[PDB]
Design a protein around this ligand. Structure first.
Ligand code: MG
Ligand code: MG
Ligand code: MG
Ligand code: MG
Ligand code: MG
Ligand code: MG
Ligand code: MG
Ligand code: MG
Ligand code: MG
Ligand code: MG
Ligand code: MG
Ligand code: MG
Ligand code: MG
Ligand code: MG
Ligand code: MG
Ligand code: MG
Ligand code: MG
Ligand code: MG
Ligand code: MG
Ligand code: MG
Ligand code: MG
Ligand code: MG
Ligand code: MG
Ligand code: MG
Ligand code: MG
Ligand code: MG
Ligand code: MG
Ligand code: MG
Ligand code: MG
Ligand code: MG
Ligand code: MG
Ligand code: MG
Ligand code: MG
Lengths: 122, 114, 209, 120, 56, 5
RNA sequence: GAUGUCGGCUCAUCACAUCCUGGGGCUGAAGUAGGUCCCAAGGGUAUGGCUGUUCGCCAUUUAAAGUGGUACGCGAGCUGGGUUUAGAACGUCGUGAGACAGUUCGGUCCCUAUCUGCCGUGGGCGCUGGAGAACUGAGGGGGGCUGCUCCUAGUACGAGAGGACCGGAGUGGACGCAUCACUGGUGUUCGGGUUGUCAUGCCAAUGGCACUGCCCGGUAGCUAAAUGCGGAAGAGAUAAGUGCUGAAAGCAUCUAAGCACGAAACUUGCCCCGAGAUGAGUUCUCCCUGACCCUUUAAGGGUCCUGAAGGAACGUUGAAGACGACGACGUUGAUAGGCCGGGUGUGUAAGCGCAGCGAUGCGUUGAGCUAACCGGUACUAAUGAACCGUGAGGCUUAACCUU
RNA sequence: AAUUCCUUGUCGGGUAAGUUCCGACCUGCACGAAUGGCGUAAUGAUGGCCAGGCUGUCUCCACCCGAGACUCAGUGAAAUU
RNA sequence: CACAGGUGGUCAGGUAGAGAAUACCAAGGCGCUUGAGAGAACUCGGGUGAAGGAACUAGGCAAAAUGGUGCCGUAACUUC
RNA sequence: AGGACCGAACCGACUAAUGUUGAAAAAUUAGCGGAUGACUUGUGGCUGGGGGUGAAAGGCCAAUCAAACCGGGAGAUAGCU
């Protein structure tokens, strides 16, 4: 469950360290963004000489959440923190060339094949 | 509730091994990637177990690639193929939620040498 | 189409080879005996009245006992009626089992919902609560305004207000029939249904189709 | 809501409620018949009767358990020495409640609660 | 918060129409003691269902 | 007592 | 001899001069996407930064973030930031007291609801013998939103770029209903750890108090963040509109006669209430088959005998409940408690022994304890009765059964 | 600016977005030198603004423990009319 | 008013504590002059909370949070 | 040493909630300020109404203050209701 003002870590090497969600896209009065949901974010902290800079407004896909993900059999997968992967604003493609930490299988879609291929785990 | 008991009983797994909280358990879970089926291992520390007959479940915690992960396995679900106890831990509590605040040396669990 | 009267045994989980978990409500549908048949010439509509279960004969009233004796049936928990279609026909004393739904994929389940008693507007109508701080005085979850001053000078009919919640007839539509087990008089339907465990339940084929 | 809940609050807090029944339980054991309000008598069954069952088998651990729930060695001795042996054959239902009208002071409904084997 | 007109004798009477008390339907008689008592209640001298449950 | 200046 | 302001909050309701969705006519309408006009009010019709602000600007969304009425809706519902009491200061005006839709800092928001209205829930009586059930449905209410992806099809169209109508499928947002099987919350009524102190003679072991002393977990129940379902198809009559045939008016003409099509509007379809529907309905069972007496001799009154079906009361109670009500049960009995077994939760009790100087560890031992849960069991309490309710049910006419 | 009407002046900083805030400019409607001017360490239940921590303030409320509300018995008001 | 108000001196036990704070107690004195049930909305006083963490609001109002001893260490600006 | 520091008694009254026919005609609860001083407090005394007193709010002078209270002029006057 990611809302506005939620702080998320960055699971890619795009240069951003943590970001602020400023809008949950995909509907009207939509308030929760789970794993695999595109969110509009603003970079709050970034490393120097990165490909993104503080204050940039982009969009990202949630890949890990504390609330976890529900499986068809009822099993739940949870993570110690919330993470997201920054995506190009126009083409919605990942900016970083690597993915950090485990990834969840709800991203098994045509547009997120890049993330899974680079995912260290599943 | 005799009817409910019988309905659940006929679909309970009989090969479930005996394990306790603090035990390092490796679980084989069926995973499908396209048409082909596959097995992947999720090894971690059992931090919580609920016994509810067919609805029994247990929580396994592990640190993968620097990120802590917790999986709540439905023990009787066909998705989980097998359960194996790699190590036996000695703890005084049924639930080990306090391990969420610890890592590295502080998260060590003493082995149970009965 | 005709339905049957069952009892809510409870809720249960059904596993499948593919690894999916199906939440199912277990409904016990014993033999439904036809106690009376309604005819157009005599009653003005076509329907069958059926009874299910059994009750102690000591507490059966004389007029109730006489009605069951007419159809040669043992007194049940109660009496329910089902409307008949054009081709349907039944006879007094006939027994209908859970196999009727063997060829049915979706069903309609109706029953009395759990009684919440006197409920406030927040619970009953999902009214938004007012500020818990910032000067609020004894108005944290009160309904608030209920009118528009002199022009109407009244409260309109149907205004949402606190009152009795639940304990009323409720119908849930298009519930999948996971399994029909005739040998034990059981009917497993995906999802939850109104009422607490052991409450009377009426199951009909899905009218919505 | 109060669905499938047990235990009367009796317009008291948990600490006061627990202490009151501890005293009342000892009174019923000390005096085999006592007079109290009907709702209080109904709750007293769920406290005194388990003590009698606990006294069915005599042991140091059981006596200490009885002491922790009564905090009066006189009652503990009474339960294990007399009440326990007397109710050795009864499968529950060690107490009986009889209604005795209403209290004059506040019109509260009153009822006697007594051990079933008070006959002498 | 307060009335704009004085309610009448009539309005007071109708409100009190539901205030009437109901007398006890009947008093049970002990099988042996023979005196009247409330049903499911002991008698004056401690009898109930024919047994002297209370000594006094 | 409210006021309307 | 008082009708309390702006804005916010909560809760709304109506209009249609329609913002989105729906149906159309023109288009300087190729397609996609627009422009303009007509019909349409069923549903839906952003979160934030700044500001007391409405407004407005800006950021990012959305199918769209409609315009208005309702005392510029709503303070006996909340707020009191702005204006508009008394304090104080700035600029400014005045010799001065003081003044300023100039600006600054601070500054008591009372009311237990009689009536109307509304949301719930009962009592009485009626419905023409009484009683127990199941119904018909006049009428009324609820519900009516919509995105994206895929196929059709890279087809129609277009030089290209670009890119469909019409029909299908899948999966979402918001909203609504139900429920706890699952994932979780709560769980001061279940276990365990621990600080200070007091007490049970003391050790050991326990209890009281300190917010449940502070904490860690947790049964049932309730519950959402949890997981099931819902909006519709179809039908009838239509709006704008498009037509067929066709005269008045030899032609033409959708219209005058006569036919056809046509939208989230309308009447139905789906869900709930519903015979106080006084127009009080229908169907099926159950119960009552005695004496007399009086005159104001009539739907008359009264005594005796009788007390049915059924109801109520009382008692044990409920996943029913403010109280009523409603459901279960009362010995020919599992209604509640206890009891027995089991399952849960907590996590190896106490006692004793063994190691250690000791704290402590180990064995007995996954032990002990275990609330509301599950399957059982008359051990306790649900009494033999009393009480209410009667004794064949008006007149008139019609059609039958008849003598 | 406790002073600026025009005015949310203009530029810069902070924010994804700042009528407030900070820095600067001077076009001071209508600052100004003991009815004191400009600075100032420390101090302030003082005014404005930002950040970390923190959380039911909020998204969006859920459950629980108590005192009322509700029922019974006793006593028994009030404004208003 | 048998009113949660106001009213100056003197006496000053135990354990923990720096303490006349605070907690539990001694001597001593009390349970506050309506009770009994129920366990609805709502109000009051509190406890807990998934994910987020000021998005609330005129304003972080209120809550939450920090909290003690030693020792290490501690910037600008300073009238030192 | 200190109108020094932290903090009870003690003296104050910044915030919130409750209460507002209140328990109370100004309080309660949780926080809050000072707490060796321009401190606080007991008993007694002095200042009297166009006067007192006032670290100055037109504050206070017996629940009354832009001129106290009591009695009198007095049946002031009222083109008003
Ligand atoms: Mg107030
Ligand atoms: Mg409040
Ligand atoms: Mg009003
Ligand atoms: Mg009118
Ligand atoms: Mg009480
Ligand atoms: Mg306590
Ligand atoms: Mg007037
Ligand atoms: Mg319609
Ligand atoms: Mg706005
Ligand atoms: Mg207005
Ligand atoms: Mg103000
Ligand atoms: Mg002034
Ligand atoms: Mg003015
Ligand atoms: Mg000891
Ligand atoms: Mg801010
Ligand atoms: Mg400036
Ligand atoms: Mg000046
Ligand atoms: Mg000061
Ligand atoms: Mg009373
Ligand atoms: Mg008193
Ligand atoms: Mg003290
Ligand atoms: Mg309560
Ligand atoms: Mg939380
Ligand atoms: Mg806001
Ligand atoms: Mg605060
Ligand atoms: Mg606090
Ligand atoms: Mg000092
Ligand atoms: Mg105070
Ligand atoms: Mg101090
Ligand atoms: Mg002044
Ligand atoms: Mg005074
Ligand atoms: Mg004169
Ligand atoms: Mg005069």
């Amino acid at each position: 469950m990611i809302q506005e003002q939620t702080m998320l870590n960055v699971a890619d090497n795009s240069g951003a360290r943590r970001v602020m969600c400023i809008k949950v896209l995909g509907g009207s009065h939509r308030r929760y963004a789970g794993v695999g949901d595109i969110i509009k974010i603003t970079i709050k902290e970034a490393i120097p000489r990165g490909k993104v800079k503080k204050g940039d407004v982009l969009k990202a896909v949630v890949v890990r959440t504390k609330k976890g993900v529900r499986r068809p059999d009822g099993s739940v997968i949870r993570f110690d923190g919330n993470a997201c992967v920054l995506l190009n604003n126009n083409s919605e493609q990942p900016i970083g060339t690597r993915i950090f930490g485990p990834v969840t299988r709800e991203l098994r879609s045509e547009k997120f094949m890049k993330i899974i291929s680079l995912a260290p785990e599943v | 509730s005799n009817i409910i008991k019988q309905l659940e009983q006929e679909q309970m797994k009989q090969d479930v091994p005996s394990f306790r909280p603090g035990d390092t358990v490796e679980v084989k879970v069926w995973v499908v990637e396209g048409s082909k089926k596959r097995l992947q291992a999720f090894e971690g520390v059992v931090i919580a177990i609920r016994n509810r007959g067919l609805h029994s479940a247990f929580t396994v915690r592990k640190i993968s690639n620097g990120e802590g992960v917790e999986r709540v396995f439905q023990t009787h679900s066909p998705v989980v193929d097998s359960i194996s106890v790699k190590r036996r831990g000695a703890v005084r509590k049924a639930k080990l939620y306090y391990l969420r605040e610890r890592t590295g040396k502080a998260a060590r669990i003493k082995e149970r040498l009965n | 189409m005709i339905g049957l009267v069952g009892k809510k045994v409870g809720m249960t989980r059904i596993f499948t080879e593919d690894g999916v978990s199906i939440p199912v409500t277990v409904i016990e549908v014993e033999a439904n005996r036809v106690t009376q048949v309604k005819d157009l010439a005599n009653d003005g509509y076509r329907a069958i009245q059926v009874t299910t279960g059994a009750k102690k004969a000591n507490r059966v009233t004389k007029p109730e006992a006489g009605h069951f004796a007419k159809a040669g049936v043992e007194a049940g928990r109660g009496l329910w009626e089902f409307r008949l279609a054009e081709g349907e026909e039944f006879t007094v004393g006939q027994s209908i089992s859970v196999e009727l739904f063997a060829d049915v994929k979706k069903v309609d389940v109706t029953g009395t919902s759990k009684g919440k008693g006197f409920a406030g507007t927040v619970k009953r109508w999902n009214f938004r609560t007012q500020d818990a701080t910032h000067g609020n005085s004894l108005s944290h979850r009160v309904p608030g305004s209920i009118g528009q001053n002199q022009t109407p000078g009244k409260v309109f009919k149907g205004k949402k207000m606190a009152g009795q919640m639940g304990n009323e007839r409720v119908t849930v539509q298009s519930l999948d029939v996971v399994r029909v087990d005739a040998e034990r008089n059981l009917l497993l339907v995906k999802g939850a249904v109104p009422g607490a465990t052991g409450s009377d339940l009426i199951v009909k084929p899905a009218v919505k189709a | 809501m109060r669905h499938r809940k047990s235990g009367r609050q009796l317009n008291r807090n948990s600490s006061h409620r627990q202490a009151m029944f501890r005293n009342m339980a000892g009174s019923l054991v000390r005096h085999e018949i006592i007079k109290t309000t009907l709702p209080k008598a109904k709750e007293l069954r769920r406290v005194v009767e388990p003590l009698i069952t606990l006294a069915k088998t005599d042991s140091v651990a059981n006596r200490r358990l009885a002491f922790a729930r009564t905090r009066d060695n006189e009652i503990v001795a009474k339960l294990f020495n007399e009440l326990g042996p007397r109710f050795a054959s009864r499968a529950g239902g060690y107490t009986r409640i009889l209604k005795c009208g209403f209290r004059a002071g506040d019109n509260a409904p009153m009822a006697y609660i007594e051990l079933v084997d008070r006959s002498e | 918060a307060v009335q704009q007109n004085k309610p009448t004798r009539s309005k007071r009477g109708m409100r009190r129409s539901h205030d009437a008390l109901t007398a006890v339907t009947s008093l049970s008689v002990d099988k042996t003691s023979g005196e009247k008592h409330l049903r499911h209640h002991i008698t004056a001298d401690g009898y109930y269902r024919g047994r002297k449950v209370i000594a006094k | 007592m409210f006021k309307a200046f």
